[PDB]
Amino acid sequence: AQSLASDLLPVLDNFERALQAKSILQGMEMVYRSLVDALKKEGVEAPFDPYLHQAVMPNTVVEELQKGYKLKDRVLRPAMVKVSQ
Amino acid sequence: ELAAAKAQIAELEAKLSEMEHRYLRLYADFENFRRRTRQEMEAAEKYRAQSLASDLLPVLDNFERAQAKSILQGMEMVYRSLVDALKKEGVEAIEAVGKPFDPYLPNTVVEELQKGYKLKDRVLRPAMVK
Amino acid sequence: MSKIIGIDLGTTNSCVAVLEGGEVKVIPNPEGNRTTPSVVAFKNGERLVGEVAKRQAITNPNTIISIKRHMGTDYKVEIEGKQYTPQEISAIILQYLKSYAEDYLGEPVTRAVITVPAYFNDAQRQATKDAGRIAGLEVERIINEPTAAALAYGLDKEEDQTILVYDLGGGTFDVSILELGDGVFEVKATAGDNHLGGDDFDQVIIDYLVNQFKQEHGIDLSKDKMALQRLKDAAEKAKKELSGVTQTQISLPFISHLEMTLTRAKFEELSAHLVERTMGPVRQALQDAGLTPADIDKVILVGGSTRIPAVQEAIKRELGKEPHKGVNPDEVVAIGAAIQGGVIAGEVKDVVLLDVTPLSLGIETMGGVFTKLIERNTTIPTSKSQVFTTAADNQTTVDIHVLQGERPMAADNKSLGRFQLTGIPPAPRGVPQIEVTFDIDANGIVHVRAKDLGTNKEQSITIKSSSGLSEEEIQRMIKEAEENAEADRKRKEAAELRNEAD
Amino acid sequence: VVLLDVTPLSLGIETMGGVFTKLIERNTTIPTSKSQVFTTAADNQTTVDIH
Amino acid sequence: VVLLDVTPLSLGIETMGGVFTKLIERNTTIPTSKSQVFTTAADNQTTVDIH
Amino acid sequence: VLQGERPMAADNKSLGRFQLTGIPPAPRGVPQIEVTFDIDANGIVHVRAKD
Amino acid sequence: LGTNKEQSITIKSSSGLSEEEIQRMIKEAEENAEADRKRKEAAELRNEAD
């Protein structure tokens, strides 16, 4: 099943980076929130080592560029990060 | 000894037939495995994301349901690649649209409240429908 | 013993493959990747290799990137704690490839074989067998990439001939013209481009894309690398689509958002320029050999990015005919390496015939209801066995009637055998056990046994023809089962379990 | 003729000493039961595997 | 419960050289039947005794 | 278990009763069940019932 | 027996292969039946010397 969790992580990190019309972004309690727990009931959890923070461009990892999740002891699509060199 | 030479010769030719046979029955069993296995993994991956799917039917219930007009244009690749990522797998929605409208799936479908979730010859969760 | 394991290194294209049984196999890596690639690193006391080494590469001192350029050279890298050579670094390429082929098979491969360039000579193509054994995995020979996939497919049934390959590297192009020595391969001509390929294709997508977005909103693209990553990926998509599909679009939106309807002939007139940067290498071969485009017996499509119709619409109107696509070109070097790998240390001449079963075979239940043991399509040298029991209490004897076909019915099927068996002990129905091994040889006369257990009294039959007849006659019936499409109404005799009286 | 089912392959437990010992001979029947005993491996065993 | 005739003892023949072979093992059942095969007690044995 | 001379249960001494379970479900009269009575020199008697 | 301790499993009939795999590994038993050699470990009753 991790297949819907990798190929769906582009749209999921797409809504994940987007967190009068001012009150219409509150309706985001559900769509890009609910998918977290509903994609965490299959067992999905989101030292950097071995490509783990995918480095656009000491020894520690800096922040998260486009994040990613282990399927619970698997990997399908990677995660963007930046290193303090 | 003399024709015991011929004797073992026999023995070995015999184990030739015997051997090749021992093989072709093998080729049989080997190649045979495939039909079975192929179909076994078929049924393996038609279902079993059903949990992912009917769990995900609430968050694509507000991404199918719920100044900032540019911020609403952005939802383009979100609910574009999230009914799109329900695709290569095959859990569709319910498409009848004003028909007989199978009640487990005058008397025409007027509207539909909950957007469909169905993966490969089964029923996940129904829509509350007009 | 051990099977001789393929490993190709193509500098950003690389694989270690094998052969199990009668089907050629492309291994999986430790990464989810169908293939993990050629480049690596190090750190304190601990090595890091592959797709796991390579994104710690723009983040850490140690990354080697496409070392193909230094094989067979006096090239020496200065690196932490000891300077290093192409050999010792490649020893680890294949040390990791060793642990990985091991953590796939469990039956180790010590003996192994490599995929090199057809252009190479005594210096570097020795460097292959040498560094091949540096990691610890011995080389029983070193193929060349082109003669390799040539024999992945294989040419030796066929006659004295001529050919030209297509290598598409990862951003490199090549083609090597070859001939048959009636059992011998000698690569004749060589050509291609040092940088051209798939990534470049992706960058014409990213380029006209970014340029067009500056064409609308005036706002430039390439300053931004999650955006540009978004670009590389989505544009790769549209690419391989343009290959297969007739129409496209790209949903890249919530950009900062571009939603376009991705075109094919615009991507083609986009890409129809470097397709003649190829025709150059190609015809340069046509002269290196001397024989015109009209001199060849077969020709082929290789590489990762070769899956688009661009080059193939440049060829169908170039050399007169279509390519052999009978591969999955992306990994096509790897398996090739091992083909002879198992032609040497392993199996010899192969019929692999009567690999199929005429029909589903079963026998006479409940007055003719037909149950299968043998299905159709089944490799012939086999036999399956099943044991029924008593029709009714005190069956003093049991007759056996067997069918061939699909339709679950008696004379809706072909009567095969009828023979009976007697002496059974008297006692409650269902209890006593009678076995029938359908014993199907390879050659087509089928033996079939039924014998009590508690008796050990046994009657079996040796049939004769099983067919006696032709293809159309059978398939007309294989059609016939379908054609009937529910004569299953005999679930009517399925409720004839009325037979039970209690 | 008819069905039931024979348990097409005979089952057992690794016995002690590292051998196979059938508890249910091959072609038997619709569900049945067998029971047998066996005992301590070597002096004062605390624990016993069943494979 | 009711009782069924058992073959209170198990029968057979002597087998050459010489030994008791079981044919219908002991607690067997009401009527039953069983069979087996062996061969000549010697090189082209004249005749075969069944005891 | 009953003790008397009389051909009907009712008319005899009921010494004791017990049951046995688990026998494979399967047709009447088919399963074997072996009850043995054993009497010691005392007049005390044990009964065992064993599938 | 005497301490009445009931720990036990249930097999799911899953892993065991009955398609071919049986009608194979029996004939294995026929080819290889001299596997009676087994008695070796029977003889290994040796270490039963305690």
UniProtKB/Swiss-Prot annotation, chain A:
This is Protein GrpE. The chain holds residues 108 to 213 of 213 of the full protein. Participates actively in the response to hyperosmotic and heat shock by preventing the aggregation of stress-denatured proteins, in association with DnaK and GrpE. It is the nucleotide exchange factor for DnaK and may function as a thermosensor. Unfolded proteins bind initially to DnaJ; upon interaction with the DnaJ-bound protein, DnaK hydrolyzes its bound ATP, resulting in the formation of a stable complex. GrpE releases ADP from DnaK; ATP binding to DnaK triggers the release of the substrate protein, thus completing the reaction cycle. It is found in: Cytoplasm. Homodimer. The lineage of its organism: Bacteria, Bacillati, Bacillota, Bacilli, Bacillales. The gene is grpE. It comes from Geobacillus kaustophilus (strain HTA426). Belongs to the GrpE family.
Curated annotation (Swiss-Prot), chain B:
One of its GO terms (biological process) is protein folding. It is found in: Cytoplasm. Keywords: Chaperone, Cytoplasm, Stress response. Transmembrane segments: none annotated. Belongs to the GrpE family. Participates actively in the response to hyperosmotic and heat shock by preventing the aggregation of stress-denatured proteins, in association with DnaK and GrpE. It is the nucleotide exchange factor for DnaK and may function as a thermosensor. Unfolded proteins bind initially to DnaJ; upon interaction with the DnaJ-bound protein, DnaK hydrolyzes its bound ATP, resulting in the formation of a stable complex. GrpE releases ADP from DnaK; ATP binding to DnaK triggers the release of the substrate protein, thus completing the reaction cycle. Homodimer. This is Protein GrpE. It comes from Geobacillus kaustophilus (strain HTA426). The gene is grpE. The chain holds residues 60 to 210 of 213 of the full protein.
From Swiss-Prot, chain F:
Signal peptide: none annotated. It comes from the Bacteria. Disulfide bonds: none annotated. Induction: By stress conditions e.g. heat shock. Acts as a chaperone. Belongs to the heat shock protein 70 family. This is Chaperone protein DnaK. It comes from Geobacillus kaustophilus (strain HTA426). The chain holds residues 409 to 459 of 607 of the full protein.
